[PDB]
Structure formats: structure tokens, C-alpha cells
Amino acid sequence: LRTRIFKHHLDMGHNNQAYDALTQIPDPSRQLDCLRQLVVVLCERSQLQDLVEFPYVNLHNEVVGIIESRARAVDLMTHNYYELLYAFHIYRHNYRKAGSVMFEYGMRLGREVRTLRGLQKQVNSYLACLNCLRLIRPEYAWIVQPVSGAVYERPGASPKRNYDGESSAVPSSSQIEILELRDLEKEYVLAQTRLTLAKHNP
């Protein structure tokens, strides 16, 4: 009957607003995948203010696993920019660390597709990353892969030790804290100079 309830509730989408019933599924047993697919259909209904207020009622342990699983699905490469911002709001409730990393992932994909008018967007993204760094002043946060689909682990930021010199051939792009943020600032200054040179041509 319960496996029918999943199939039938999914197809209608309308009765699938039952949040306390959604929360009443992970607490008994590891049927988290039922919540993951059902809350995606509720995201397809797409009333994000109401939708994000109900995971305040849902337990934070479940909300972290469901919202992180949702955030990995947010790396869909969709034109829904808002899904990153609503993930940032859930990160705001928690330790906030992952909202900064998700922004660099979204910056990377937006750089890869095409250039030029993306420069002003990259300036706004630098402002967002700088503000997020000011919010999270003492704590460190690590990057893995250039976004979701990760096959790398965590090389850390204290393993600056080598072995022989062949073990220092790890990409070492876990430690994408304050130093690489200063390199993004250099990319911004390079963009400013290119625009000023471009303005002196006409």
C-alpha cells in the first residue's frame, strides 16, 4: 500500500504537498529517496517561498540530506538561476560554507559556455563571493571537482607535504579559499583593463 502511495501521489502532484507526511517517511526508515523524488515534483509545482518555509518544519538532519541531494540536482545546468539562491538561503540557515562553493561552481559553468557579456556577470559573482567570504570570516571551506559529478576526494589544505615530488602532482584545487579568491580578483582587474582599453578605441 505504501509503495502504491508513492506511485499514485507522484502522478497527481497535487496531494504531494503533504510535508509532515514527507518528514514522517525518513524518520521510520531509509526511504529518503521517496522524499527526494516527491519533493522534486513539489519543486515542479514551483512555489518556492511556501516550499522552502515547510523545510523549516522538517528536521534539519533530513533537510541537509534532502537539500544537498536537491543541490546536486540544481547543478542541472538549467536557466533556473533562482535554485542556487534558494540553496544559498538553506545554507544561510546552516553553516553557510557550501553556498560559496556552489557559487564558484555556477561561475565555472557560466564561463565555459560563452564569454564577453558574461564579464559583468562575473563582476557580480565576485561581489557575491566577496560578501559570502565576509559572512564566513574564520571558517574554511573546500572545493571538490569544478561542480557535482565528483571523482576526486579531499586533498585538504594542511597536506602541503610532498612524498618524493610525484605526490605533489595532485591538482591541489581543494584549497580554493582566500588565495584563489585573490586570483579571481586578478581576473576582475584583467577584465577592467580590457574594458578600459576597449573604451579608448572608439
Partner: peptide, 18 residues
Amino acid sequence: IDNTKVEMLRLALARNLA
């Protein structure tokens, strides 16, 4: 002031979601 700024960003995110 930074916290106040964050609120505006959150509002913008909500608008994007809408």
C-alpha cells in the same frame, strides 16, 4: 550592515525563484 545586505540578496534569490 553586512547582515542587512545578505537579506537583500536573499530577497533577490526569492524573486528569482518566483
